[PDB]
Amino acid sequence: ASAARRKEQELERSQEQALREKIDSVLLPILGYGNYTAQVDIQMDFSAVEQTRKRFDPNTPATRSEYALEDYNGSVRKESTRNFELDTTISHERKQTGTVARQTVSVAIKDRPMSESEINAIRQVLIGTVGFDQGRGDLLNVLSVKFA
Amino acid sequence: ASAARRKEQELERSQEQALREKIDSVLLPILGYGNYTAQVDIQMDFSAVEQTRKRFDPNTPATRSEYALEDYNGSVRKESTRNFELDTTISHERKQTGTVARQTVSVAIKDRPMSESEINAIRQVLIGTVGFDQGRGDLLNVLSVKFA
Amino acid sequence: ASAARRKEQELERSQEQALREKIDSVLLPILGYGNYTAQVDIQMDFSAVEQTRKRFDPNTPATRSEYALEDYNGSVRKESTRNFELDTTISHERKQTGTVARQTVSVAIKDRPMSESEINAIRQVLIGTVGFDQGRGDLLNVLSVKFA
Amino acid sequence: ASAARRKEQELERSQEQALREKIDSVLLPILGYGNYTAQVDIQMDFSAVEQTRKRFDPNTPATRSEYALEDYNGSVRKESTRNFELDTTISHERKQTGTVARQTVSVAIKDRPMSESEINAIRQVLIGTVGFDQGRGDLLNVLSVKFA
Amino acid sequence: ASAARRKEQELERSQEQALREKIDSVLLPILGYGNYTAQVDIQMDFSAVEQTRKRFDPNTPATRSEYALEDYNGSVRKESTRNFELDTTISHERKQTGTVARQTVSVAIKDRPMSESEINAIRQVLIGTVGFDQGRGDLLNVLSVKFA
Amino acid sequence: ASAARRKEQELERSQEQALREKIDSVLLPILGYGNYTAQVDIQMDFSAVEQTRKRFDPNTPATRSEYALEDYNGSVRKESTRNFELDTTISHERKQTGTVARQTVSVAIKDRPMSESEINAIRQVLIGTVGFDQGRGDLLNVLSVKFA
Amino acid sequence: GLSRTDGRHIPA
Amino acid sequence: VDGIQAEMRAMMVEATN
């Protein structure tokens, strides 16, 4: 199984490399060659979830058989027996093993600095270039630093 | 199964490449060569959902057999027994494995900037060029940036 | 099964290509060569729905056997037993796997702009050229843009 | 089964081609060569419906056996038992797989425009040339546009 | 089965061709060569209906055995038991698969226009030339148009 | 079975051809060569009806055994039991498959017009030449038109 | 009564 | 499933009748 773990590491590294390639394909025309640096971290879960759900519909029952005895005298006896049929959904789901659980991307732009408007524009391009998903916990940093 | 995961990555990359090709086929005449850059992120779910639904119709029962005893004297006894037949739908669905769960497209247009009207027109063309589906969670960014 | 998914992608791309061919066959005479650009997105569901419906007719029962005891004295006893026969429809449906769930078409017309009347006329031709179905969620954009 | 889906696409395209051929055979004499353009969209359902209906006739029962006890004293007891025979129809239907569920035809006529009377006459010829069926949801557009 | 569907399309096209041949055989002497154009649409159902009907005759029963007890005292008891024999028809029908469900014919006559009387006379000839059946939903259009 | 449907079409066409031959054999001497045109439409049902009828005679029963107790005292008790024998007809019919369900004939006579008396005489000859059966729904049109 | 219900208990 | 099999049996009853 350790060979499987090794190949999982290979998958994660391949994903990171592909994302880096896309980042380059976007930023190389916009910024130029050597005016930026970017690295990508991709964390992938490899669990084996397998779920079975059996759901009913309480608010729409359908009476199948029914008995109702109601006699008076004073005495009032109200017996009743009822059998129901209910909407039944049975869903069996099997999640894919390797899923990107969190994605971190950081891009540093060489100074000569960059204005806030262009930094936010680059961030907007990257959002969509990488597939930024904040609800997944992903993080995207864009900074303007001084290259040596 | 890790080979299957590798081929799933290949499928996702192929989808992204096809969408990029369509984006180019639309924008190359409109904008020109080298006046734009665009990248596409496609996230695909590969679950194995398999659902079985059994639904009834509570509001239209059909009486199959019926017994009704109603005697008086004062004393009033009202016995009743009833059997019903109901509309029964049984649907077994099996979803396709790989489905595009979210799609992100970002396009950056070289300045010399672009007016808001033409930006929105390009966005309208892309909506339909790519098959934008906001209800799916898809995202489409169109920006006017300064190429270096 | 991933080979099946690949061939599903091929089917979707083939459908898009055919629709593009029809769009060209309509617009090339009307507009000319190079005066327009159009792209088509086709999303196809590949579920495996298989439904069985058993429907009755509550409002037209036919009495098969019947017992009715009605004695008086005062005391009034009204016993009754009844058996019914009902209209029974049993339909087993099996949907076709790959069905176009949503269709998006966008057409951009080169300026020198186009009047609203001719834009709507082109839209009317396309509706029928492509088989526009708004109830399915399809979308058709026709814009007049400035080609570079 | 994907090969079956491919051949279904082939069937749809063949139907569209045949309808286009008929449209040409009608309009080429009337309008001329190159004075019109027309495209046809045909959507075909490929479900596998298979229905079984069991219908009765409540209003014409035939008594098979009958018992009737009616004694007096005052006391009045009216017992009764009755067995019936009913008209029974049992129909098993199996629909053909591929059926044209919706048909869209659009025809554009080159200007030099066309009067409303002749447009409606051409529409009347097409209705019958194509087999227009509004109740099926079919759509037929005839427009007069300016060819370039 | 798709080969069967293909041959069904072939059958429909053959029927249309035969009807067109008959239309020509009637109109070529009457109108001349090239003075008319006509196209025929034939829609054929290919269901597999198979019905079984069991019908009785409620109003002419024949008593097979009979018991009748009628004692008096005052007390009046009228017991009765009766068995019946009824006319029973059992018909099993199996419809032919391919049946013309709707037929559409349109004929356009070259102007130099045609008077209403002769248009109606041509319509009367066609009714019988084609086997017009309005109750089936068939449609027959005869117009006088200007050939180019 | 589609080959069977093809041969059914062949049968219908053969019937139409035979009727046309008879029409010619009657009208060629009377009217001449080229002074008339006639076409015949024959619709044939190919169902597989198979009926079984069991009929009785309620009004002529024959008593087989009989018991009759009639005692007096006042008290009057009239018991009776009776068994009957009835006329029983059991007919099993199997209809021929292909039967002409409707027949349409139209004849057009070249002008130089024809008087009403001779038109009705020709109609009378055709009635009997073709076997006109109005109760079957058949239709026979005879018109006087202007040949070109 | 119809014990048809997979959980029919009323029975009577 | 069971309902479809019942429908098939009903069609077989039709054919036998």
G10 in reach of chain B (CB within 8 A): no
Q: Rounded to whole angstroms, what are the CA distances from B30 to A125, B109, C148, D99, E119?
A: 20, 11, 5, 41, 54
Select from E47, E52, E89, E91 the residue whose CB has the most chain H CBs within 10 Å, as the one to mutate to test that interface: E52
Direct distance between the N- and C-terminal alpha carbons of chain E, in angstroms, rounded to an integer = 45
E40 contacts on D by Cβ (under 8 Å): 128
Chains that touch A (3 or more CB pairs under 8 A): B, G
CB atoms within 10 A of CB F17: 12
Cα gap F112→F144, rounded to integer Å: 10
Amino acid making up residue E51: Q
Listing DSSP states for E39-70 in one string gives EEEEEEE----EEEEEEE-TT--EEEEEEEEE
Cα gap A146→A113, rounded to integer Å: 8
CB E143 within 8 A of CB E113: no
CB A144 within 8 A of CB A109: yes
G7 in reach of chain B (CB within 8 A): no
Which of the 8 DSSP states describes residue A4? H
Cα gap B118→C147, rounded to integer Å: 11
Of D134, D114, D143, the closest CA to residue D39 belongs to: D143
Q: Do A32 and B86 touch (CB under 8 A)?
A: no
3-state secondary structure of D119: helix
Of E54, E46, E44, the closest CA to residue E95 belongs to: E46
Buried b (16+ CB within 10 A) or exposed e, D115-145: eeebbebbebbbbbbbbbbeeeebbbbbbbb
Sheet architecture: strand order including C88-94: A50-56, A88-94, B50-56, B88-94, C50-56, C88-94, D50-56, D88-94, E50-56, E88-94, F50-56, F88-94
* Paired sense of beta strands D99-110 and D139-145, if any: parallel
Amino acid making up residue B146: K
* H13 to chain C, closest Cα gap in Å: 14
Cα gap E75→C32, rounded to integer Å: 104
Cα gap E18→F101, rounded to integer Å: 20
- The alpha-carbon radius of gyration of chain B (Å, integer) is 30
Amino acid making up residue B29: P
Residues 1-60 of A with CB under 8 A from B: 4, 7-8, 11, 14-15, 18, 22, 25-26, 29-32, 35, 60
Burial of residue D50 (number of CB atoms within 10 Å: 0-12, 13-18, 19+): buried
In the numeric block, which tokens belong to residue F119?
């038109």
Nearest by CB: B39 against A15, A22, A65:
A22
Chains that touch E (3 or more CB pairs under 8 A): D, F, H
* A107 to chain B, closest Cα gap in Å: 16
Cα gap B75→A70, rounded to integer Å: 11
Of E58, D87, E86, the closest CA to residue F53 belongs to: E86
Query: Resolution to 1 decimal, in Å?
Result: 3.6
H10 in reach of chain C (CB within 8 A): yes
Cα gap F144→A26, rounded to integer Å: 81
Select from D71, D106, D109, D132 the residue whose CB has the most chain C CBs within 10 Å, as the one to mutate to test that interface: D106
Listing DSSP states for E89-129 in one string gives EEEEEE--S-EEEEEEEEEEEE-----HHHHHHHHHHHHHH
Listing DSSP states for C3-28 in one string gives HHHHHHHHHHHHHHHHHHHHHHHHHH
Instruction: Compute CA C5 distance to the chain's CA centroid, rounded to the nearest angstrom.
Output: 23
Instruction: Compute CA A8 distance to the chain's CA centroid, rounded to the nearest angstrom.
Output: 19
Determination technique used? cryo-EM
Cα gap F38→F105, rounded to integer Å: 7
Chains that touch F (3 or more CB pairs under 8 A): E
**How many residues in total does chain D contain?**
148
* E27 to chain D, closest Cα gap in Å: 16
D25 contacts on E by Cβ (under 8 Å): 37, 39
Angle between helices A116-129 and A2-31 (to 10 degrees): 140
Question: C-alpha dihedral over B45, B48, B50, B51, to 10 degrees?
Answer: -40
Do G and F make contact, counting contact as 3+ CB pairs within 8 angstroms?
no
C69 in reach of chain D (CB within 8 A): yes
A85 contacts on G by Cβ (under 8 Å): 5
Cα gap F20→F27, rounded to integer Å: 10
Handedness of CA B61, B66, B71, B76 (dihedral sign): negative
From B79, which residue of chain C is nearest by alpha-carbon distance? C79
Quote the Cα angle for D139-D145-D148, to 5°: 135
- Residues 6+ away with beta carbon under 8 Å from D36: D27, D107, D108, D109, D110
Amino acid making up residue E10: E
* Paired sense of beta strands E99-110 and E139-145, if any: parallel
Cα gap A140→A40, rounded to integer Å: 9
Buried b (16+ CB within 10 A) or exposed e, H1-17: eebbeebeebbeebeeb
C15 contacts on B by Cβ (under 8 Å): none
Quote the Cα angle for C75-C81-C82, to 5°: 140
Three-state secondary structure string covering F121-133: HHHHHHHHHCCCC
Beta bridge partners of F141: F106
CB E118 within 8 A of CB F145: yes
Buried b (16+ CB within 10 A) or exposed e, E45-54: bbbbbbbbbb
* Paired sense of beta strands F139-145 and F99-110, if any: parallel
CB A108 within 8 A of CB A125: no
Q: Do F13 and E14 touch (CB under 8 A)?
A: no
Cα gap E1→E14, rounded to integer Å: 20
CB B103 within 8 A of CB B12: no
Amino acid making up residue B54: K
* G1 to chain B, closest Cα gap in Å: 6
Of B25, B32, A120, A39, the closest CA to residue C146 belongs to: B32
In the numeric block, which tokens belong to residue C114?
């186009």
CB pairs < 8 Å spanning E and H: 11
Phi, psi (5° rounding) for residue A65?
A: -130, 155
Helix or strand holding residue F15 (H, E): helix F2-31
Cα gap F120→F109, rounded to integer Å: 12
Residues 85-144 of C with CB under 8 A from B: 86, 102, 104-106, 108, 139-141, 143
Of F60, F39, F10, F13, the closest CA to residue F104 belongs to: F39
Buried b (16+ CB within 10 A) or exposed e, F73-99: eeeeeeeeebbbeeeeeeeeeeeeeee
* C17 to chain H, closest Cα gap in Å: 39
* Paired sense of beta strands D50-56 and C88-94, if any: antiparallel
Handedness of CA B108, B112, B118, B121 (dihedral sign): negative
Q: Rounded to whole angstroms, what are the CA distances from B59 to B83, B84, D55?
A: 15, 12, 21
* CB half-sphere exposure, D88, CA atoms < 13 A: 17
Q: Do D87 and E55 touch (CB under 8 A)?
A: yes
Listing DSSP states for A92-142 in one string gives EEE--S-EEEEEEEEEEEE-----HHHHHHHHHHHHHHT---GGGT-EEEE
Beta bridge partners of F50: E92, F94
B83 contacts on G by Cβ (under 8 Å): 1-2
A15-24 long-range contacts, CB within 8 A, separation 24+: A15/A42, A15/A44, A15/A100, A15/B9, A16/A40, A16/A41, A16/A42, A18/B9, A18/B13, A19/A103, A19/A105, A19/A130, A22/A129, A22/A130, A22/B39, A22/B41, A23/A105, A23/A107, A23/A126, A23/A129, A23/A130
From C18, which residue of chain D is nearest by alpha-carbon distance? D13
* E102 to chain F, closest Cα gap in Å: 13
* B88 to chain H, closest Cα gap in Å: 9
In the numeric block, which tokens belong to residue E83?
């068995």
Phi, psi (5° rounding) for residue E66?
A: -155, 135
CB atoms within 10 A of CB F4: 12
